[PDB]
Design an enzyme around this catalytic site. Structure first.
Site, PDB file in Angstrom:
ATOM      1  N   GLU A   1       0.823  -1.214   0.000  1.00  0.00           N
ATOM      2  CA  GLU A   1       0.000   0.000   0.000  1.00  0.00           C
ATOM      3  C   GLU A   1       0.857   1.265   0.000  1.00  0.00           C
ATOM      4  O   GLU A   1       0.639   2.171   0.808  1.00  0.00           O
ATOM      5  CB  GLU A   1      -0.938   0.008   1.215  1.00  0.00           C
ATOM      6  CG  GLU A   1      -1.764  -1.254   1.374  1.00  0.00           C
ATOM      7  CD  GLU A   1      -2.835  -1.138   2.440  1.00  0.00           C
ATOM      8  OE1 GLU A   1      -2.729  -0.266   3.333  1.00  0.00           O
ATOM      9  OE2 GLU A   1      -3.795  -1.928   2.373  1.00  0.00           O
TER      10      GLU A   1
ATOM     11  N   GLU B   1      -5.053  -9.560   2.121  1.00  0.00           N
ATOM     12  CA  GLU B   1      -5.792  -9.460   3.375  1.00  0.00           C
ATOM     13  C   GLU B   1      -7.288  -9.557   3.081  1.00  0.00           C
ATOM     14  O   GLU B   1      -7.749  -9.090   2.037  1.00  0.00           O
ATOM     15  CB  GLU B   1      -5.524  -8.126   4.068  1.00  0.00           C
ATOM     16  CG  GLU B   1      -4.131  -7.966   4.655  1.00  0.00           C
ATOM     17  CD  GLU B   1      -3.864  -6.560   5.161  1.00  0.00           C
ATOM     18  OE1 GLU B   1      -4.818  -5.764   5.286  1.00  0.00           O
ATOM     19  OE2 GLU B   1      -2.691  -6.244   5.431  1.00  0.00           O
TER      20      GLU B   1
HETATM   21  O1  LIG Z   1       5.817   1.773   2.044  1.00  0.00           O
HETATM   22  C1  LIG Z   1       4.613   2.397   2.499  1.00  0.00           C
HETATM   23  C2  LIG Z   1       4.716   2.708   3.997  1.00  0.00           C
HETATM   24  O2  LIG Z   1       5.191   1.524   4.657  1.00  0.00           O
HETATM   25  C3  LIG Z   1       5.176   1.660   6.082  1.00  0.00           C
HETATM   26  O3  LIG Z   1       5.573   0.417   6.683  1.00  0.00           O
HETATM   27  C4  LIG Z   1       4.701  -0.687   6.403  1.00  0.00           C
HETATM   28  C5  LIG Z   1       3.803  -0.934   7.612  1.00  0.00           C
HETATM   29  O4  LIG Z   1       2.919   0.180   7.825  1.00  0.00           O
HETATM   30  C6  LIG Z   1       2.976  -2.186   7.378  1.00  0.00           C
HETATM   31  O5  LIG Z   1       2.174  -2.415   8.540  1.00  0.00           O
HETATM   32  C7  LIG Z   1       1.258  -3.510   8.434  1.00  0.00           C
HETATM   33  C8  LIG Z   1      -0.173  -2.967   8.348  1.00  0.00           C
HETATM   34  O6  LIG Z   1      -0.372  -2.313   7.081  1.00  0.00           O
HETATM   35  C9  LIG Z   1      -1.191  -4.110   8.499  1.00  0.00           C
HETATM   36  N1  LIG Z   1      -2.566  -3.666   8.794  1.00  0.00           N
HETATM   37  C10 LIG Z   1      -3.693  -4.286   8.448  1.00  0.00           C
HETATM   38  C11 LIG Z   1      -4.641  -3.523   8.961  1.00  0.00           C
HETATM   39  C12 LIG Z   1      -6.163  -3.724   8.891  1.00  0.00           C
HETATM   40  C13 LIG Z   1      -6.695  -2.652   7.966  1.00  0.00           C
HETATM   41  C14 LIG Z   1      -8.194  -2.712   8.173  1.00  0.00           C
HETATM   42  N2  LIG Z   1      -8.979  -2.083   7.072  1.00  0.00           N
HETATM   43  C15 LIG Z   1     -10.361  -2.352   7.039  1.00  0.00           C
HETATM   44  C16 LIG Z   1     -11.169  -1.804   6.049  1.00  0.00           C
HETATM   45  C17 LIG Z   1     -10.611  -0.978   5.077  1.00  0.00           C
HETATM   46  C18 LIG Z   1      -9.244  -0.698   5.089  1.00  0.00           C
HETATM   47  C19 LIG Z   1      -8.419  -1.240   6.077  1.00  0.00           C
HETATM   48  N3  LIG Z   1      -4.052  -2.515   9.586  1.00  0.00           N
HETATM   49  N4  LIG Z   1      -2.856  -2.646   9.468  1.00  0.00           N
HETATM   50  O7  LIG Z   1      -0.898  -4.884   9.671  1.00  0.00           O
HETATM   51  C20 LIG Z   1       0.410  -5.481   9.640  1.00  0.00           C
HETATM   52  C21 LIG Z   1       0.576  -6.468  10.807  1.00  0.00           C
HETATM   53  O8  LIG Z   1      -0.197  -6.033  11.917  1.00  0.00           O
HETATM   54  C22 LIG Z   1       1.439  -4.367   9.681  1.00  0.00           C
HETATM   55  O9  LIG Z   1       2.776  -4.899   9.697  1.00  0.00           O
HETATM   56  O10 LIG Z   1       3.854  -3.298   7.169  1.00  0.00           O
HETATM   57  C23 LIG Z   1       4.661  -3.156   5.990  1.00  0.00           C
HETATM   58  C24 LIG Z   1       5.503  -4.431   5.872  1.00  0.00           C
HETATM   59  O11 LIG Z   1       6.310  -4.587   7.042  1.00  0.00           O
HETATM   60  C25 LIG Z   1       5.556  -1.919   6.123  1.00  0.00           C
HETATM   61  O12 LIG Z   1       6.295  -1.726   4.906  1.00  0.00           O
HETATM   62  C26 LIG Z   1       6.175   2.735   6.485  1.00  0.00           C
HETATM   63  O13 LIG Z   1       6.163   2.933   7.906  1.00  0.00           O
HETATM   64  C27 LIG Z   1       5.834   4.052   5.792  1.00  0.00           C
HETATM   65  O14 LIG Z   1       6.882   4.986   6.050  1.00  0.00           O
HETATM   66  C28 LIG Z   1       5.681   3.858   4.278  1.00  0.00           C
HETATM   67  O15 LIG Z   1       5.160   5.070   3.708  1.00  0.00           O
END
Ligand SMILES: OC[C@H]1O[C@@H](O[C@@H]2[C@@H](O)[C@H](O[C@@H]3[C@@H](O)[C@H](n4cc(CCC[n+]5ccccc5)nn4)O[C@H](CO)[C@H]3O)O[C@H](CO)[C@H]2O)[C@H](O)[C@@H](O)[C@@H]1O
Length: 429
Positions: A136, A235
């Site tokens: 994303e 997901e």
């Molecule tokens: O590259 C884009 C961005 O990446 C960010 O890191 C990334 C990080 O945010 C991402 O986080 C995920 C995260 O996206 C994911 N997650 C799932 C959800 C549920 C969403 C529910 N939902 C329901 C309805 C509609 C929409 C959404 N919320 N979070 O949960 C994972 C495990 O709990 C978690 O590791 O994991 C990546 C890999 O490790 C990192 O690359 C960086 O921190 C940012 O700087 C950068 O801009």
């Protein structure tokens, strides 16, 4: 031993078991622990993974999505234990502190070294299904210019894997579901000379007791019919209605969707104050099964996707640029060059060590010298000569250019900060 998980390969737009030749459908769940390293690596800790694998076996999953591993740690105990139960792993190459920043995108030696480290740590395992080169990154119409950097990462990860001795594990992408960008993103990641190997969508359109027609699943399926690479839900599991009945699973592995989609992964195993878990880890580090568990278990057990075999199966333009809609150039940044960027550490007179200040230091230095050589523009497809170096190397280059512009030649770098130092190696690629 990995007999029970033969390596999965891609042919056209489908996954296949490399031994049997049967189509492989992902029946998965996300598996990743957080803190309250920054990330926790459950696959590097046998007491965690060996506690959970029995519960994952009960769910009936054949795949996990893992978002972050520590590449300095061993993973063979957990990966072999997963293989023992016929379970594969989809693995993101990035982590929260080393990712392509959607607010200021770069594809550089620091992020590429992270990707290489994960690849070298995890590619020996036959049950490593695939790698995600991003998650994303572009998420709406305001940051579509991040996507060329992700495509460069896909290319370079694939080339790194190709040039290694490893099995050629596919490298794909995981995207969100924003209405304005989703069609362009899907086309972009298979357009031109560089392509994702597979495409995961984080799909939350189906909430509660919905249907194939009313959820949006039918329109998504018609959109992705004939898409040239494997597509799946990286997901799923909207939690608007609880306990989640997971009736989307019946649709996903039914005959209409099983011809298009390669399955999907529920989000997620662990409960983390977000009502997305199927289990909760108590204060005694034991696994308490939550109300969702039985519903996902039953739905995966009932699912029986009618695929096609490998032998019977065997028998694009990039989206145009439009201001405020789509701003991803087909032209990609070059492969980050560790040797070139490492030569800056040798020869530059003024250097800065890593440890807010970046914004101030770039703003200051780029008013005095031309920073074009470190800028990267995904809209216009203009990538400076040293735009692939690390943020510190980039800053050091500009500080050194200012030092040479003044021309005092007195070892006093023109920026008063403790991280700044004169490089004595410069006096001696
Ligand atoms: O590259 C884009 C961005 O990446 C960010 O890191 C990334 C990080 O945010 C991402 O986080 C995920 C995260 O996206 C994911 N997650 C799932 C959800 C549920 C969403 C529910 N939902 C329901 C309805 C509609 C929409 C959404 N919320 N979070 O949960 C994972 C495990 O709990 C978690 O590791 O994991 C990546 C890999 O490790 C990192 O690359 C960086 O921190 C940012 O700087 C950068 O801009």
């Amino acid at each position: 031993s990995f007999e029970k998980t033969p390596a999965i390969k891609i042919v056209g737009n489908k996954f296949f078991d490399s031994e049997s030749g049967e189509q492989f459908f992902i029946k998965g769940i996300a598996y990743q622990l957080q803190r309250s390293t920054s990330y926790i690596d459950a696959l590097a800790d046998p007491k965690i993974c060996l506690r959970d694998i029995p519960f994952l076996k009960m769910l009936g999953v054949n795949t996990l999505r893992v978002y972050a591993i520590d590449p300095t740690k061993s993973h063979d105990i957990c990966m072999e234990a997963l293989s023992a139960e016929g379970m594969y792993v989809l693995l993101d190459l990035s982590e929260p502190d080393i990712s392509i920043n959607r607010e200021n995108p770069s594809w550089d030696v620091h992020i590429f070294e992270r990707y290489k480290s994960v690849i070298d740590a995890m590619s020996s395992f036959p049950n490593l299904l695939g790698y995600f080169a991003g998650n994303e990154v572009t998420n709406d119409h305001t940051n579509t210019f991040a996507s060329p950097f992700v495509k460069a990462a896909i290319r370079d990860a694939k080339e790194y894997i190709s040039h290694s001795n490893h099995r050629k594990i596919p490298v794909g992408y995981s995207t969100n579901d924003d209405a304005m960008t989703r069609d362009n993103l899907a086309r972009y990641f298979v357009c031109g000379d560089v392509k994702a190997d597979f495409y995961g969508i984080n799909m939350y359109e189906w909430c509660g007791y919905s249907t194939y027609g009313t959820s949006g699943y039918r329109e998504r399926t018609k959109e992705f019919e004939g898409y040239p690479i494997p597509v799946f839900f990286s997901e799923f599991g909207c939690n608007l209605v609880r306990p989640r009945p997971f009736t989307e699973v019946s649709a996903l592995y039914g005959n209409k969707m099983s011809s298009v989609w390669s399955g999907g992964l529920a989000y997620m195993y662990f409960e983390e104050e977000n009502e997305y878990g199927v289990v909760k880890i108590n204060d005694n580090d034991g696994v308490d099964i939550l109300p969702d568990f039985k519903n996902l278990k039953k739905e995966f057990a009932k699912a029986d996707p009618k695929g096609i075999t490998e032998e019977e199966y065997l028998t694009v333009e990039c989206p145009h640029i439009a201001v405020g809609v789509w701003e991803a150039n087909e032209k990609l940044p070059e492969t980050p060059d560790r040797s070139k960027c490492a030569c800056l550490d040798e020869i530059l007179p003024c250097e800065i060590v890593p440890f807010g200040k970046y914004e101030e230091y770039f703003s200051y230095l780029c008013s005095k010298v031309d920073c074009s050589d470190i800028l990267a523009n995904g809209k216009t497809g203009e990538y400076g000569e040293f735009s692939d170096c690390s943020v510190e190397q980039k800053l050091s280059l500009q500080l050194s250019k200012l030092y040479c512009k003044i021309g005092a030649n007195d070892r006093h770098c023109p920026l008063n900060d403790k991280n700044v130092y004169f490089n004595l190696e410069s006096l001696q690629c």
